[PDB]
Amino acid sequence: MKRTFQPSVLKRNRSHGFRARMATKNGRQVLARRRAKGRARLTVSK
Amino acid sequence: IREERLLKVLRAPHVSEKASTAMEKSNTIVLKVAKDATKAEIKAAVQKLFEVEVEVVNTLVVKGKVKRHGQRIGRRSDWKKAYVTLKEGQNLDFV
Amino acid sequence: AVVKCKPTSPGRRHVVKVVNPELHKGKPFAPLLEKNSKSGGRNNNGRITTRHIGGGHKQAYRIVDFKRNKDGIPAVVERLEYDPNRSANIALVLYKDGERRYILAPKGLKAGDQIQSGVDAAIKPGNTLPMRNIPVGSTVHNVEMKPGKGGQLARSAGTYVQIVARDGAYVTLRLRSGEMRKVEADCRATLGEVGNAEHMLRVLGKAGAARWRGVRPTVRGTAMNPVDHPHGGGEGRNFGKHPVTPWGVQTKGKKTRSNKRTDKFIVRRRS
RNA sequence: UGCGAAUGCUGACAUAAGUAACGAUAAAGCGGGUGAAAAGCCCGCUCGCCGGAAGACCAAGGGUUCCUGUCCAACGUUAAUCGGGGCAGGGUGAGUCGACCCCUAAGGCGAGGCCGAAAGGCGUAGUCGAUGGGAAACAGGUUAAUAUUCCUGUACUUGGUGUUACUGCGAAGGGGGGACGGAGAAGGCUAUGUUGGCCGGGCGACGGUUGUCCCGGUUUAAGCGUGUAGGCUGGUUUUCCAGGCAAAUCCGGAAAAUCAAGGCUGAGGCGUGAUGACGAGGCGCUGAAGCAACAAAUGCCCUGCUUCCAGGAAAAGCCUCUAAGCAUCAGGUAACAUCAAAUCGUACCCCAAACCGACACAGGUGGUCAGGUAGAGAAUACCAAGGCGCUUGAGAGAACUCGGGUGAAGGAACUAGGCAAAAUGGUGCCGUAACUUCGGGAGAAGGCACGCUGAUAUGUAGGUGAGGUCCCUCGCGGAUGGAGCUGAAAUCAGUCGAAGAUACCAGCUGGCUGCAACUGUUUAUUAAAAACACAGCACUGUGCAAACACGAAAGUGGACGUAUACGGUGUGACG
RNA sequence: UAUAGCUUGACACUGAACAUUGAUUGAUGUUCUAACGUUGACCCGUAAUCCGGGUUGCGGACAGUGUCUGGUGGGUAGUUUG
Ligand SMILES: [Mg+2]
Ligand SMILES: [Mg+2]
Ligand SMILES: [Mg+2]
Ligand SMILES: [Mg+2]
Ligand SMILES: [Mg+2]
Ligand SMILES: [Mg+2]
Ligand SMILES: [Mg+2]
Ligand SMILES: [Mg+2]
Ligand SMILES: [Mg+2]
Ligand SMILES: [Mg+2]
Ligand SMILES: [Mg+2]
Ligand SMILES: [Mg+2]
Ligand SMILES: [Mg+2]
Ligand SMILES: [Mg+2]
Ligand SMILES: [Mg+2]
Ligand SMILES: [Mg+2]
Ligand SMILES: [Mg+2]
Ligand SMILES: [Mg+2]
Ligand SMILES: [Mg+2]
Ligand SMILES: [Mg+2]
Ligand SMILES: [Mg+2]
Ligand SMILES: [Mg+2]
Ligand SMILES: [Mg+2]
Ligand SMILES: [Mg+2]
Ligand SMILES: [Mg+2]
Ligand SMILES: [Mg+2]
Ligand SMILES: [Mg+2]
Ligand SMILES: [Mg+2]
Ligand SMILES: [Mg+2]
Ligand SMILES: [Mg+2]
Ligand SMILES: [Mg+2]
Ligand SMILES: [Mg+2]
Ligand SMILES: [Mg+2]
Ligand SMILES: [Mg+2]
Ligand SMILES: [Mg+2]
Ligand SMILES: [Mg+2]
Ligand SMILES: [Mg+2]
Ligand SMILES: [Mg+2]
Ligand SMILES: [Mg+2]
Ligand SMILES: [Mg+2]
Ligand SMILES: [Mg+2]
Ligand SMILES: [Mg+2]
Ligand SMILES: [Mg+2]
Ligand SMILES: [Mg+2]
Ligand SMILES: [Mg+2]
Ligand SMILES: [Mg+2]
Ligand SMILES: [Mg+2]
Ligand SMILES: [Mg+2]
Ligand SMILES: [Mg+2]
Ligand SMILES: [Mg+2]
Ligand SMILES: [Mg+2]
Ligand SMILES: [Mg+2]
Ligand SMILES: [Mg+2]
Ligand SMILES: [Mg+2]
Ligand SMILES: [Mg+2]
Ligand SMILES: [Mg+2]
Ligand SMILES: [Mg+2]
Ligand SMILES: [Mg+2]
Ligand SMILES: [Mg+2]
Ligand SMILES: [Mg+2]
Ligand SMILES: [Mg+2]
Ligand SMILES: [Mg+2]
Ligand SMILES: [Mg+2]
Ligand SMILES: [Mg+2]
Ligand SMILES: [Mg+2]
Ligand SMILES: [Mg+2]
Ligand SMILES: [Mg+2]
Ligand SMILES: [Mg+2]
Ligand SMILES: [Mg+2]
Ligand SMILES: [Mg+2]
Ligand SMILES: [Mg+2]
Ligand SMILES: [Mg+2]
Ligand SMILES: [Mg+2]
Ligand SMILES: [Mg+2]
Ligand SMILES: [Mg+2]
Ligand SMILES: [Mg+2]
Ligand SMILES: [Mg+2]
Ligand SMILES: [Mg+2]
Ligand SMILES: [Mg+2]
Ligand SMILES: [Mg+2]
Ligand SMILES: [Mg+2]
Ligand SMILES: [Mg+2]
Ligand SMILES: [Mg+2]
Ligand SMILES: [Mg+2]
Ligand SMILES: [Mg+2]
Ligand SMILES: [Mg+2]
Ligand SMILES: [Mg+2]
Ligand SMILES: [Mg+2]
Ligand SMILES: [Mg+2]
Ligand SMILES: [Mg+2]
Ligand SMILES: [Mg+2]
Ligand SMILES: [Mg+2]
Ligand SMILES: [Mg+2]
Ligand SMILES: [Mg+2]
Ligand SMILES: [Mg+2]
Ligand SMILES: [Mg+2]
Ligand SMILES: [Mg+2]
Ligand SMILES: [Mg+2]
Secondary structure (H helix, E strand, O other), X not given: OOOOOOOOHHHHHHHHOHXXXXXXXXXXXXXXXXXXXXXXXXXXXX | OOHHHHHHHEEEEOOOHHHHHHHHHOOEEEEEEOOOOOHHHHHHHHHHHXXXXXXXXXXXXXXXXXXXXXXXXXXXXXXXXXXXXXXXXXXXXXX | OEEEOOOOOOOOOOOEEXXXXXXXXXXXXXXXXEOOOOOOOEOOXXXXXXXXXXXXXXXXXXXEOOOOOOOOXXXXXXXXXXXXXXXXXXXXXXXXXXXXXXXXXEOOOOOOOEEOEOOOOOOOOOOEEEOOOOOOOXXXXXXXXXXXXXXXXXXXXXXXXXXXXXXXXXXXXXXXXXXXXXXXXXXXXXXXXXXXXXXXXXXXXOHXXXXXXXXOOOOOHHHOOOOOOOOOOOXXXXXXXXXXXXXXXXXOOOOOOOOOOOHHHEEEOOO
């Protein structure tokens, strides 16, 4: 049957993209936390 | 267009079976060009350097494949492929 | 006219509709409609501020003239039209200078009638003028509350207010709810009553009829759980508590009006 | 600092055990080839399955899985020479397809602004935001892999510039259009199919088959011209008023003069496109026929028409009118000639082994195409095009389990309970009770006929409809006319079988009674119900800056509503 | 046991003049504008249903807000119930 993950790139980028993170302050804090940990991938941008 | 710009747009002639078949049947040469080279500057650089009269230019961006050199996995860079169509009375000059 | 459907199917048994043959058929006037998007009972925050709203048919908004500021210009009723936004029907009127507008169709006004609005206008159904010039005891509708704000009182179908007294600058009106309210005499009104008085004799007949108008199902608080409604749940059918709204406030008789700004304008409460 | 325990943590290895299982019972057999090795690879002939799909093609999602060569280390639930596996190379060609771009919906952000301990919330002007509106291409050919992109032929759209001949052009403004609902139906059509003609080939391993016989084909687009079935709508003129903030020659209103027409839209048809392409076959060359009638779409006219209430986007492109400003200038118009149409995607899978399910998983996944025979039918059965035999096989034919078939006599005696099974099942006609809200109950119940052949009637009723004749500007015209094609149903007589709704498909029925009026909703994953909802009823609050609700507040919903309205509560048709 | 909300009074924003009236000081009522409200009208910023300013009109020391305060307050919260 229908599972919980329905892949859509538009919804993905509008929810978790880089510009979405930079738009809000908590998103910028998330990006800072990810840069501090040394994540090779900050967001879902491709 | 800048003369220094046309010198850098061309990369290399593309050797292949399809390219050779098009060269002797459609009178079209396949060339490796810069990724940012447009059709206008491609035609200008070809007419300036190869000394051939270009009819029309078709381009396409080839995506790089994933390979493995030893134990490391890499991704080859992308490159644009130009189908330069010369006029019927024009042959190609190799220099 | 009023007509009862035939009990062919179980949904048409109790349906009682009102079909007006004098209403215009076809698309309304083009340069008088506006985009009207449904809300669903949700405010700017997105939460449901008013329950039981949502769905229904699509509706274009008809710009209705409630102020009637075009004074000293005769107008002729072109045709009565249907309005889904209000319970009263509207009438497209044409002015002497070639201007079309929407007005609340009063009771009895048919196509081809002459209407005017102004201090110099005449006393007839559909004419607008300041309440200081309207004779006492007359039945008016689309009455303003401020001098130049537009008609707010008696705008539904079959509603009307009566001028019970005029003393100085204020005019005492008897509202449709039985209230006596003082209003500035400089405010305007329209003679007659609001048409479509047979609107209250209609019966939907089925839940689908209510769902077409944007009304959603109402769940009784007694059928909910204690966490959902103050009436809460229980073992079987138990109430055991005073009836209250779903926020703790006691309904069924408790007055909720608290407004000291407009008490001076209210003569006698309803009953 | 000492380990045997803490259902202790990590790694390795036993046990069950060479046991279950190898993932839909659609199915395989044989010959040849390669190969170390062949049930699984390729080729060939038979067999079986799907065929509103297990076929074809897109949008999402994935990203090289696409094609070629090579390898069988690991992966593939077996082997593997094979692969969506490893390695190398190749492959995606656009002014016309989509993105991009112009315009907006819901919604988002938001200069100033308001509000708020801060962080921030709302929001004007604006700017983003498709799932919507806006310019333009078709047919054939070609690769191992791309094609509406490459080639051939034949087209179309937009913009810049230059020249020639005319000319009031101009918006961040006004008007029109864009521009819009459900259901029903038939008038003409087309896609398409059947048959007849013609063309090419055959005269059949077994009784006949030179004919009313067998097989196959019988195709052709966009565009341009013509302007038809149909649909909508009176046209031109002049004087006036100024509603569209200013103006208007535009729209709006008024008055008279005039003509019986005018304009817009519009499938399909025909000519051209096309002396071409394609074309069964024959020898990379050539290549005949390529027509007619009938039937007919859910597709087109049709954004039509009728009807109904629940009353059914916006803006831009486009047309039109002028303000400021410019008057041999600019700008606009018509013709021609050149230039430009950039960038990005294009491979491949999308009823799946490639997306979502940890899997090469009996699940899910939006959109378009829609052949023949029966059939009302997109059901169903068998087939076409096309695609597959589902990645462990070979034997035997125990109990037992699973899915089915049949069954003497009896027929619910079983069981908590007719659970499950068995049974009915279609068309046409006849006929049909209590009760009833007069609509129903009802397909009540029940009964009769159904195949094939001949005649009525060498094919009737009906449908379509050619040639000829007459009429009129003279035509895609009207009357006539009926060839031809097509074509039910009924009766009569005969006939065959056990049986003619012969297969698949395809109501079991009646009586009493509780509950809920009913159609609907509900505990995704043990409860679908008497529970929830519901139309109806009553009470109650609210006079608008409404009550009420979300918000420290601003603000928003209520509602661009106004007591015949809105909110809350209880009950639940109707008598 | 508290608290959001609702609600009562006092003080501040919050004034003027008169009449009645309880004790130089309070309360009541009637008029007024100048505080303040205006989700009434027009104009400007401005080719803007936000906002600000101006004029006018209507309300008007009312409403409303701040501190303190009495009541109510399973709406919410923390707990007890040997
Ligand atoms: Mg080209
Ligand atoms: Mg390209
Ligand atoms: Mg790189
Ligand atoms: Mg509009
Ligand atoms: Mg609204
Ligand atoms: Mg309600
Ligand atoms: Mg409405
Ligand atoms: Mg209810
Ligand atoms: Mg109700
Ligand atoms: Mg419950
Ligand atoms: Mg419970
Ligand atoms: Mg409670
Ligand atoms: Mg009980
Ligand atoms: Mg009791
Ligand atoms: Mg140890
Ligand atoms: Mg121990
Ligand atoms: Mg254990
Ligand atoms: Mg064992
Ligand atoms: Mg065993
Ligand atoms: Mg076994
Ligand atoms: Mg098996
Ligand atoms: Mg199994
Ligand atoms: Mg060999
Ligand atoms: Mg073999
Ligand atoms: Mg096999
Ligand atoms: Mg084979
Ligand atoms: Mg089927
Ligand atoms: Mg395919
Ligand atoms: Mg993609
Ligand atoms: Mg993947
Ligand atoms: Mg790709
Ligand atoms: Mg790979
Ligand atoms: Mg492959
Ligand atoms: Mg081996
Ligand atoms: Mg293996
Ligand atoms: Mg390979
Ligand atoms: Mg491979
Ligand atoms: Mg396009
Ligand atoms: Mg918006
Ligand atoms: Mg914002
Ligand atoms: Mg700011
Ligand atoms: Mg935009
Ligand atoms: Mg779109
Ligand atoms: Mg392909
Ligand atoms: Mg406009
Ligand atoms: Mg329009
Ligand atoms: Mg639309
Ligand atoms: Mg429709
Ligand atoms: Mg046809
Ligand atoms: Mg022959
Ligand atoms: Mg023989
Ligand atoms: Mg034949
Ligand atoms: Mg006119
Ligand atoms: Mg209609
Ligand atoms: Mg109605
Ligand atoms: Mg001028
Ligand atoms: Mg492609
Ligand atoms: Mg493709
Ligand atoms: Mg699909
Ligand atoms: Mg599947
Ligand atoms: Mg998968
Ligand atoms: Mg498999
Ligand atoms: Mg699968
Ligand atoms: Mg079929
Ligand atoms: Mg058939
Ligand atoms: Mg059948
Ligand atoms: Mg089959
Ligand atoms: Mg086949
Ligand atoms: Mg397939
Ligand atoms: Mg298998
Ligand atoms: Mg057996
Ligand atoms: Mg069995
Ligand atoms: Mg059986
Ligand atoms: Mg038996
Ligand atoms: Mg028997
Ligand atoms: Mg029996
Ligand atoms: Mg029995
Ligand atoms: Mg028994
Ligand atoms: Mg027994
Ligand atoms: Mg059963
Ligand atoms: Mg059965
Ligand atoms: Mg029957
Ligand atoms: Mg019955
Ligand atoms: Mg026909
Ligand atoms: Mg017999
Ligand atoms: Mg059934
Ligand atoms: Mg009982
Ligand atoms: Mg029920
Ligand atoms: Mg039901
Ligand atoms: Mg359940
Ligand atoms: Mg329920
Ligand atoms: Mg507020
Ligand atoms: Mg509001
Ligand atoms: Mg109840
Ligand atoms: Mg009851
Ligand atoms: Mg304002
Ligand atoms: Mg408590
Ligand atoms: Mg504690």
